[PDB]
Every structure is written in structure tokens, then in C-alpha cells.
Write a protein that binds this ligand. Structure first.
Ligand code: SF4
Ligand SMILES: [Mg+2]
Length: 548
């Protein structure tokens, strides 16, 4: 018997930092949360069956990453979509089971690999069962490690999805996803074995971020130094949000010559840094701030909005008629832009709607500079190294990650403003919006905020650090003049954290709170072995991270 209507604690904003049990803080309703649990459960069973067969296939690999992405915070609020995804997994699982060479193994299989439902009512009943809840794992340390691994796997799945959209893949990462999912169903594993899998999850997060970096840069060019306008023009626009650059490619192609401008929002900002998008005259600039302001900013934008990934907030009535979903995003009543047989998407109706809209309300004017991904920073290596050797740059501070609504996040704005003028902030992901419009200036022409791109472009920050480690002949990445004060919100940030731990980064400050899914004993290991700490006050953290 489920002790509460739902249980979800996978993001930074979980209620009281102990768990959403009646309705999600994000707006995810109990029935949706329980259906998402059943979707994860169904994916775990599908992984068990594929591991029994000994191999997977492309349609199953894509399904598994897409189904996991469907359950990431702020992606899909639509119970109908989640039910359809559950049924798709059951059909793929039954297909796989029909190809089994050892079907006598059925009775030894965990329930997630064999459960069935003969009706939508039986699906809902199963979704409401205790066995599909996150709380089904009874020991709190085993639960903590399984959930941490699972959320790291969701983050891998999101980034892998984007690589696959662009025609890139790595079947070893999919093999790891299945292995990890199976492990969370395996009561024979010890906590040490789960701990090893969490570390291996960081290794595969590096590999996945490397693959997505290859996909984005081979397709659209290497990011380069770019000034991005944050004001508006006088034409109707379409605002594109989330992370998917292929969606933008098609939107820009289809709006060329139409009189409809295109603007980016939140994690679409880094598209401006890629040469393939810079080429379009009607690609205007970046509108507003990070995802949590979107109810106000999407209304002010006046034109249609295309949400390619998270973060989607349950929309205000004022713009519900002009916000569209795509990819795995969903919300009841929002129309979707589906892929055709080739993965092409048709924005014609969004464009015809945009022609009838007022132009965007100006929220601000000016320009921000960005595009300091790994190729661009490597081209500046002599200048960066010279600034380090002279002490013009005494310390880099990685403040990358993912913003959110909690006002405690003011810490990051105040921290950025109080840093001394001989430090440089390295950023990526929407955490940047706490400090990327502050006018912090430059050090000998190197901006004091260096934006490498989306949260996945934390990969570039790791590559830059590893290059500086090589240049300075250090044998420990932590011997660089670098500090980490990272903000997190959902599961892609968890995968980024694990990647950093796997790469050997110690003493990360993680905030503005520590995840609810760390049990006391698990958090103890992160503190004592990896040096993780939470934020305190700006002055104390400036002192410990910068001046000592
Ligand atoms: S995704 Fe976050 S806010 Fe939403 S229900 Fe889960 S823990 Fe709560
Ligand atoms: Mg519905």
C-alpha cells in the first residue's frame, strides 16, 4: 500500500527537501507522478528482458532513453502521453520476450519484467501500487544509491537522446544504461557494488557528454565568441526553449523569408554561439532569463513558443493557445510538433499563427558575450595561460549547472558580484542566468564570465581544465587554480555531477541544497571522500573557496 498519494524527490525543489507526496512543487499531479514511476518500472523490465536476450536494437535503445527523458523534471505533465509510453514499452518487451531463447527463465524474473495489464484501469492500479514506487526499496542506503544511480542514468539518457536525434550513437552507453537499470532490480547487489555503479555512471556521463559535444559541433560548428542581443525587434517572433538544436535548425530554415523572427530562451541561448545559426539574419537574440520566469516572459513575448525539452512550467492561460511541445515534452491541451518518417518537423502552423501576433514586449536591451566552449578556449590558450602566470587571473570558479525558483539562489548572484576582480567565472547551463547580465567586465580582454553553453557543455569546462592540467604539468586536476560552486536542479545536473566526480574533481560545493535522495550515510561518503559541501553564506564561501 503506497503510504501517500505519490512520492517523488528527484529534483532540487522537492517539498521540504524530503519529498513531494500530494502534488509536485513542479506541478506534477499525483496520477502523473505514479504513471511516471510505472514508466520507469516498465523501462527497467524492458532492460531486464534485453539483458536476458543479450543484445538490444535501435528502436529499443531510442525508446529507453526517450521514456527515461519523459520522466525528467519539467518534461511531461500529460498522463495520456505517459500511458502511451508505458504501453509502447510493454509492446517492445513482449516482442523481445517472443525472441527469447530461454523462456523458462520467466518465473525467476523480477516483477517489472513480467507485469501485465489488460486495461487502462489496470495500468492505473499498478501505477498506484507500492511495488512501483521509489519507496519500494526498503533499506535507506540501498534506496539512496539506487535512486542516485537512476537519476544519473536519466541525465545520460537525455543527452544521449539529443546525440541520437543528430545521428550519433554509442551502443556501449546504452549497454551501461541497461546494466544500471537491471542493477536497481537486483536485490543480490551490495551497497559497495551499487557505489561502483554510481562511479561508472559518471564515466558514462563523460562519454555521453563527449558524444553530444561531437554531435553538436560536427553538425553546427564549434561555438565561437559571439555577442548576443537581449533586446527585441519589431516583427512577430517565435521563441524556442529547451535544448534541442536540430529543432532550431528546422525552425530557422522554415521562418526564413516569412517576416517572423526567431528568439532563443533559457537553454537555447548557446545556439547563438554556433556558426550554423549565426548565419540567419532573422535569428534575433535571447529573450528573458532562465526557465522559472517563463509564465511571465512567455506571456510578454506575444508570439508562439516551441518547447523542445525541459524545463516546461504548467502554462498560464494567457499563452496556452500558442505554446507547442515537441520531442518527449508534453502537457494536456498543448499541440505537439511530431517528427515525420525522416525526423523532419513542420512548423508551418506555428509560423502562420506567429504572423498574427504582436511583436515581443521589450524586457531589456544590451548584449551578452558567450561561446567559450573547448575549441574557442583552446584557441585562446596562450592568452589564458599568460593571465594565469601573471596572476591577472588568480582563480577560476565553475558556477555552471542548473537555475531554479528558490530565492536562496540569490546566493549565486551575490557570490558572483563579491568575487574579486582577478577571478573568472566559468559557466554552462541555466545557472548562468544568476550572473551573466551583471557587467563584470574583463581581464585583459578575457570576459570575467565565460559561457561554454548548455549544461551538456560542462563537457567543455572539463576539457578546458584537463588542457590546463596538461599545460601546467600537474598530475591532479584539483591542483589547478579552480573552485567549483555548482547549482543543480534536475537529473541532467546529477549526471554532470557524477561526471565531475569520476574525473577526479574534489571539494565541489553543491547547492542551493543537497539532494533529498542522499541518505545520511551516502551523504557522509560524498562529504568525507569527495569533499562535497553545501553552500553556507556568501562571505564564508568566498573566503574558503577563493582566499584560502
Ligand atoms: S520532479 Fe521535483 S518538484 Fe516535481 S514532483 Fe519530483 S521532486 Fe517534486
Ligand atoms: Mg489527461
Amino acid at each position: 500500500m503506497r503510504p501517500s498519494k505519490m512520492f517523488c524527490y528527484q529534483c532540487q525543489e522537492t517539498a521540504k527537501n524530503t519529498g513531494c507526496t500530494i502534488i509536485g512543487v513542479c506541478g506534477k499531479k499525483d496520477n502523473v507522478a505514479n504513471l511516471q514511476d510505472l514508466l520507469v518500472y516498465t523501462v527497467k523490465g524492458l532492460a531486464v528482458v534485453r539483458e536476458n536476450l543479450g543484445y538490444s536494437n535501435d528502436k529499443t535503445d531510442r525508446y529507453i532513453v526517450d521514456a527515461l527523458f519523459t520522466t525528467i523534471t519539467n518534461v511531461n505533465f500529460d498522463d495520456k502521453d505517459i500511458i502511451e509510453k508505458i504501453k509502447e514499452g510493454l509492446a517492445l518487451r513482449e516482442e523481445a520476450a517472443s525472441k527469447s531463447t530461454c523462456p523458462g527463465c520467466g518465473g525467476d524474473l523480477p516483477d517489472c519484467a513480467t507485469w501485465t495489464a489488460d486495461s487502462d484501469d489496470e495500468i492505473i492500479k499498478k501505477a498506484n501500487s507500492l511495488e512501483v514506487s521509489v519507496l519500494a526499496t526498503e533499506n535507506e542506503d540501498v534506496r539512496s544509491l539506487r535512486e542516485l544511480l537512476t537519476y544519473g542514468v536519466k541525465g545520460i539518457a537525455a543527452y544521449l537522446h539529443h546525440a541520437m536525434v543528430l545521428g550519433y550513437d554509442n551502443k556501449d552507453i546504452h549497454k551501461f544504461i541497461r546494466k544500471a537499470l537491471v542493477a536497481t532490480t537486483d536485490d543480490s547487489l551490495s551497497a559497495d557494488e551499487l557505489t561502483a555503479l554510481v562511479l561508472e555512471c559518471g564515466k558514462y556521463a563523460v562519454d555521453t557528454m563527449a558524444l553530444l559535444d561531437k554531435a553538436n559541433t560536427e553538425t553546427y560548428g564549434h561555438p565561437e565568441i559571439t555577442e548576443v542581443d537581449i533586446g527585441v525587434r519589431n516583427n512577430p517572433g517565435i521563441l524556442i526553449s529547451g535544448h534541442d538544436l536540430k529543432d532550431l535548425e528546422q525552425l530557422l530554415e522554415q521562418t526564413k523569408g516569412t517576416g517572423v523572427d526567431v528568439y532563443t530562451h533559457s537553454e537555447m541561448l548557446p545556439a547563438h554561439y554556433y556558426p550554423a545559426f549565426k548565419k540567419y539574419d532573422h535569428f534575433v537574440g535571447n529573450y528573458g532569463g532562465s526557465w522559472w520566469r517563463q509564465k511571465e516572459e512567455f506571456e510578454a513575448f506575444n508570439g508562439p513558443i516551441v518547447m523542445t525539452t525541459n524545463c516546461l512550467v504548467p502554462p498560464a492561460e494567457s499563452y496556452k493557445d500558442r505554446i507547442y511541445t515537441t520531442g518527449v515534452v508534453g502537457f494536456p491541451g498543448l499541440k505537439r510538433i511530431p517528427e515525420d518518417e525522416n525526423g523532419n518537423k513542420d512548423f508551418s502552423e506555428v509560423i502562420e499563427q506567429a504572423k498574427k501576433c504582436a511583436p515581443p514586449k521589450q524586457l531589456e536591451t544590451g548584449k551578452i558575450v558567450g561561446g567559450f566552449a573547448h575549441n574557442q578556449v583552446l584557441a585562446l590558450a596562450d592568452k589564458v595561460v599568460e593571465a594565469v602566470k601573471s596572476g591577472a587571473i588568480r582563480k577560476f570558479v565553475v558556477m555552471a549547472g542548473c537555475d531554479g525558483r528558490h530565492p536562496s539562489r540569490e546566493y549565486y548572484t551575490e557570490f558572483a558580484k563579491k568575487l574579486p576582480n582577478d577571478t573568472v567565472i566559468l559557466t554552462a547551463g541555466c545557472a548562468k542566468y544568476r550572473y551573466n547580465k551583471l557587467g563584470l567586465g574583463d581581464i585583459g580582454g578575457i570576459p570575467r564570465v565565460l559561457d561554454a553553453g548548455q549544461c551538456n557543455d560542462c563537457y567543455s569546462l572539463a576539457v578546458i581544465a584537463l588542457k590546463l592540467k596538461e599545460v601546467f604539468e600537474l598530475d591532479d586536476i584539483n591542483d589547478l587554480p579552480i573552485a567549483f560552486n555548482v547549482a543543480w536542479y534536475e537529473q541532467k545536473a546529477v549526471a554532470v555531477l557524477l561526471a565531475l566526480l569520476y574525473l577526479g574533481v574534489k571539494d565541489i560545493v553543491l547547492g542551493p541544497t543537497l539532494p533529498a535522495f542522499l541518505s545520511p550515510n551516502v551523504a557522509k561518503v560524498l562529504v568525507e571522500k569527495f569533499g562535497i559541501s553545501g553552500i553556507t553564506t556568501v562571505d564564508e564561501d568566498i573566503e574558503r573557496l577563493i582566499n584560502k
